[PDB]
Design a protein around this ligand. Sequence first.
Ligand SMILES: OC[C@H]1O[C@@H](O[C@H]2[C@H](O)[C@@H](O)[C@H](O)O[C@@H]2CO)[C@H](O)[C@@H](O)[C@@H]1O
Ligand SMILES: *[C@@H]1O[C@H](CO)[C@@H](O)[C@H](O)[C@H]1NC(C)=O
Ligand SMILES: *[C@@H]1O[C@H](CO)[C@@H](O)[C@H](O)[C@H]1NC(C)=O
Ligand SMILES: *[C@H]1O[C@H](CO)[C@@H](O)[C@H](O)[C@@H]1O
Ligand SMILES: [Mg+2]
Ligand SMILES: [Mg+2]
Length: 435
Amino acid sequence: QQIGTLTTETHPPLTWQTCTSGGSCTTNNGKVVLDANWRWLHSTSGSTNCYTGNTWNTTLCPDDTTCAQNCALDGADYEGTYGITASGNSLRLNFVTNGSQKNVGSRTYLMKDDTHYQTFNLLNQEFTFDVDVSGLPCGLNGALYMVPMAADGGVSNEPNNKAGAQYGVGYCDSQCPRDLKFIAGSANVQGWEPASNSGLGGNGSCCAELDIWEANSISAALTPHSADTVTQTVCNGDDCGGTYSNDRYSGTTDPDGCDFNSYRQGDTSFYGPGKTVDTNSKFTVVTQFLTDSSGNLNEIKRFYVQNGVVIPNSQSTIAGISGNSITQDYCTAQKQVFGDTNTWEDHGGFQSMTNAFKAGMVLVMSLWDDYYADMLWLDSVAYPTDADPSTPGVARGTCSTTSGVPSDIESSAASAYVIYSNIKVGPINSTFSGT
Ligand SMILES: OC[C@H]1O[C@@H](O[C@H]2[C@H](O)[C@@H](O)[C@H](O)O[C@@H]2CO)[C@H](O)[C@@H](O)[C@@H]1O
Ligand SMILES: *[C@@H]1O[C@H](CO)[C@@H](O)[C@H](O)[C@H]1NC(C)=O
Ligand SMILES: *[C@@H]1O[C@H](CO)[C@@H](O)[C@H](O)[C@H]1NC(C)=O
Ligand SMILES: *[C@H]1O[C@H](CO)[C@@H](O)[C@H](O)[C@@H]1O
Ligand SMILES: [Mg+2]
Ligand SMILES: [Mg+2]
């Protein structure tokens, strides 16, 4: 994609902290950038749309390459159009914004400078942030996560990609998404078809994915996802696997991940409104990436801090699945007991995530509803909706099986929002303390 020049692109500021072993921290003045899919895409010679609604202009975009040559991503009105406001240490994303057009959700990335994403290798480190999820009902997901996107947005070896990180180009994840308009410096117009549960193009954008945080006020999940190749690869149609494929597990990535949702793991009193981690108020989320003696990831721990109290992650209470952290033993046990295919292990598990960190992870902060499964996998009394909650792994939250339909919640929860704040990174136990 080209650089549009009709609207200035100014990245809102967001500062975050790097901490020493002793708990002393210094500030980094970063910025955030909106993902390219949300932007205006128009001709390089004027305001004619290359895409709008869910269809492409086939004169400007007769194939993937010509489309990339002809089409420019332009600047974003962060607050006015997308309901994104970044001030000091805080980033707020609103669910619905009624500007000239209705906008739903957003996906943003943390930048190092105006043309490069910040990258993170968190091995032997922890990532910590504060979050307000009190305004997120059933069906919404305030996600904070990491994917090994190219730091420059792909520009270095993609001749038709001038827009790059500056315009939020380069996304990939463990679902191998085919709804992306641009992938690896080409458009995705070839094979494009409108789809109600997303449109979808001929190709998808695959990579490993570390879902540090996927949550609303009801349920939360922590989920690493492996991949054969940890950085971006391009897949072809149904061979992609993932959410938009006829065989979900036929691709090169792990679309399910090794998840820890306290409720799914049998503790229904731990996370939620009025619960131990009380989602009616702000709290701190600490995620630690522990290694073996060879420097390979072998454990992900989680702590919360609320009201100055340090709260360890809840124990899994499911018979056959013990502990309160993500480890080799936990993942093997959980997939066996829940009867879920262990694509996590198949695509390299902890070694894959180790290599993803070594490649360098970009921080993603998003707010979304789920046109595929209504977020039921996160927060439903049963997923799939016809399964027995008596079966371990079926229940994930307290939301009804009819909850989270986009057309419903985009009206009924239009005021929903999430706030991420006070991001801190450093050695183990450097970013938090309390009773
Ligand atoms: O694609 C939707 C959603 O799937 C999540 O994996 C689910 C999986 O769909 C289900 O079959 C299994 O029983 O539970 C897992 C964990 O909830 C995946 O973790 C998400 O990233 C993804 O958005
Ligand atoms: C598609 O783009 C061409 C070339 O700019 C333009 O002439 C035409 O009006 C566009 N089509 C639509 C439906 O906007
Ligand atoms: C970090 O703090 C946790 C919680 O108190 C503790 O279990 C762990 O031993 C500590 N690790 C280090 C390296 O201090
Ligand atoms: C479009 O169709 C899909 C099924 O193909 C539905 O899930 C969605 O609600 C919409 O009607
Ligand atoms: Mg293509
Ligand atoms: Mg509440």
